[PDB]
């Protein structure tokens, strides 16, 4: 046929739209940019790797000098 | 067999290498937490008395106060014991610790200075290190400076200075947010 | 089984919620509160599935965080809050008030009420006795306890609640000739007048009612809820709970359809 059916939302102000709309819809319209992230497994693998360090896990190279 | 010597008064620590056994003979058969004289270590140690605090075995196990044995024993360490850090509420784990009787088997001793001698140590007692933090509670601030009941404890807190990374601006001051 | 449950499986939820068997595997699992789990009205089901104000689960909690919706004059902020019989739901921003009441088919329906009527409630009394210090008190069907009540009030009666100060203002005795609405059983939602009551020592007494159209039915005492003597105090929904048979419903359906169009 030549008929099409969908859904529509009309917002009071442009600022009210960005407050309630989901992010993925914003990317479709081009208002907002996409989020850059790593894969789901790489994020999970990194999370479990940091469970073996206690305190100031950002830099842990101090243990390289123990062997001399 | 290394020695770890610490100076609580000056807040300084040092590590020395000792290879001659007859100097270490007087340390043997002593218990953890006892008093010993440092004279056999050398002429520079005259007038010094030291306190035995702990040590490590050759395999790496630490000494535990309260167990009388020259060898090492397996124990069921609960929460609150010395060489155990539980990972879960109510957890109990069986571990192995080395006794509190000093012997030739251990690899490192830990000991501290109780009484200063006439001579100085080249790298231990000739330098001092400052404290890190001042008091934060309200009553402790008053006692430290011997203030009266109403002396505006706000004004007497210790404040240091810090500056940004490379902004070129002036440094500012930091304060501890008095509690109680 | 090693503790209490926290999940509700779809296809096991109460039937009167009218939930589709597809589109997911779980159900809202109403939280603990003043009303029983079997017969309650979770707020998310009311807002999203009946009023259709919120599209999905994510936006249902967005409304609640703004404290827009309140029940019995006090704002509630959890989506799975168990509402029940006689509760008053007020949304000030849109400007209407709701009362939760059964229809003739045994399920909750939307029912507009005026602002003047949305400031009082009524509930069945559960027990009367002396508390700590000798102070008398009673508890209603929605876990409201009130001290210093009228000594004439006994169990199984109903009391009008101010809902602003929580004080009893008038009451109705439980006796023959009263007007009552059923809350449980197969005769759920019917409205009738108590004809007479028969009691059995050892529990489970029964009462006989009579409909407006001279129909007759019976129910256990635990399912009868007095709402008035004559001219019921609350505003009844459309149909007044008369329970037309299946023959009349299709007769009425086509008569209404052809008359309008």
């Amino acid at each position: 046929g030549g008929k099409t059916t969908g859904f529509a939302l009309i917002y009071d102000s442009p600022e009210a739209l960005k407050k309630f709309e989901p992010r993925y819809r914003l990317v479709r319209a081009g208002l907002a940019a996409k989020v850059e992230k790593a894969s789901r497994q790489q994020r999970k693998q990194r999370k479990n790797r940091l469970k073996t360090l206690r305190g100031t896990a950002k830099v842990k190279g101090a243990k390289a000098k123990k062997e001399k | 067999m290394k020695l770890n010597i610490s100076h609580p008064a000056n807040g300084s620590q040092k590590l020395i290498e000792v290879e001659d056994e007859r100097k270490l003979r007087h340390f043997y058969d002593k218990r953890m937490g006892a008093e010993v004289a440092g004279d056999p270590l050398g002429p520079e140690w005259k007038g010094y008395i030291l306190r035995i605090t702990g040590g490590n075995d050759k395999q790496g196990f630490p000494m535990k106060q309260g167990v009388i044995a020259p060898n090492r024993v397996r124990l069921l360490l609960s929460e609150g014991h010395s060489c155990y850090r539980p990972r879960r509420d109510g957890e109990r784990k069986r571990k192995s610790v080395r006794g509190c009787i000093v012997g030739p088997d251990l690899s490192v001793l830990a000991l501290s200075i109780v009484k200063q001698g006439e001579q100085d140590i080249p790298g231990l007692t000739d330098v001092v290190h400052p404290k890190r933090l001042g008091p934060k509670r309200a009553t402790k601030i008053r006692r430290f400076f011997s203030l009266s009941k109403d002396d505006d404890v706000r004004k007497y807190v210790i404040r240091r200075e810090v500056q940004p990374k490379g902004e070129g601006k002036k440094p500012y001051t930091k304060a501890p947010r008095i509690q109680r | 089984a090693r503790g209490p449950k926290k999940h509700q499986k779809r296809l096991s939820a109460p039937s009167h919620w009218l939930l589709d068997k597809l589109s997911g595997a779980y159900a809202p699992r109403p939280s603990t509160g003043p009303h029983k789990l079997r017969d309650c009205m979770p707020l998310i089901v009311f807002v999203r599935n009946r009023l259709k104000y919120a599209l999905n689960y994510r936006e249902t909690k967005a409304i609640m965080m703004q404290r827009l919706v309140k029940v019995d004059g006090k704002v509630r902020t959890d989506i799975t809050y168990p509402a029940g019989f006689m509760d008053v739901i007020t949304i000030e921003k849109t400007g209407e008030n709701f009362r939760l009441i059964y229809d003739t088919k045994g399920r909750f329906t939307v029912h507009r009420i005026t602002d003047e009527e949305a400031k009082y409630k009524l509930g069945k009394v559960k027990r009367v006795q002396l508390g700590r210090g000798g102070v008398p008190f009673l508890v209603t069907h929605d876990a409201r306890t009130i001290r210093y009540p009228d000594p004439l009030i006994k169990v199984n009666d109903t009391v009008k609640i101010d809902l602003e100060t929580g004080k009893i203002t008038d009451f109705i005795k439980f006796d023959t000739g009263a007007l009552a609405m059923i809350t449980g059983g197969r005769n759920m939602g019917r409205v009738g007048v108590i004809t007479h009551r028969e009691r059995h020592d050892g529990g489970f007494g029964i009462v006989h009612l009579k409909d407006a159209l001279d129909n007759t039915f019976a129910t256990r005492e635990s399912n009868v809820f007095v709402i008035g003597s004559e001219k019921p105090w609350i505003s009844l929904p459309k149909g007044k709970g008369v329970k037309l048979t299946i023959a009349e419903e299709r007769d009425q359906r086509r008569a209404r359809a052809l008359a309008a169009a």
Binding site: - | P130, K131, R132, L133, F145, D150, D152, Y156, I158, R159 | -
Partner: protein
Amino acid sequence: IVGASLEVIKERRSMRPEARNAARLAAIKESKEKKAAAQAAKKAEKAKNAAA
């Protein structure tokens, strides 16, 4: 302590009571005049705003 060298601590603990007494009197009046200034500023401003 790192914040104050040893000369600072004993200087502050051994300050004579006369200096401390002056500090209390200087501070107590500073707040009093500060409080009074805010009290008069608000009461007069509301009068002219109401009039015009």
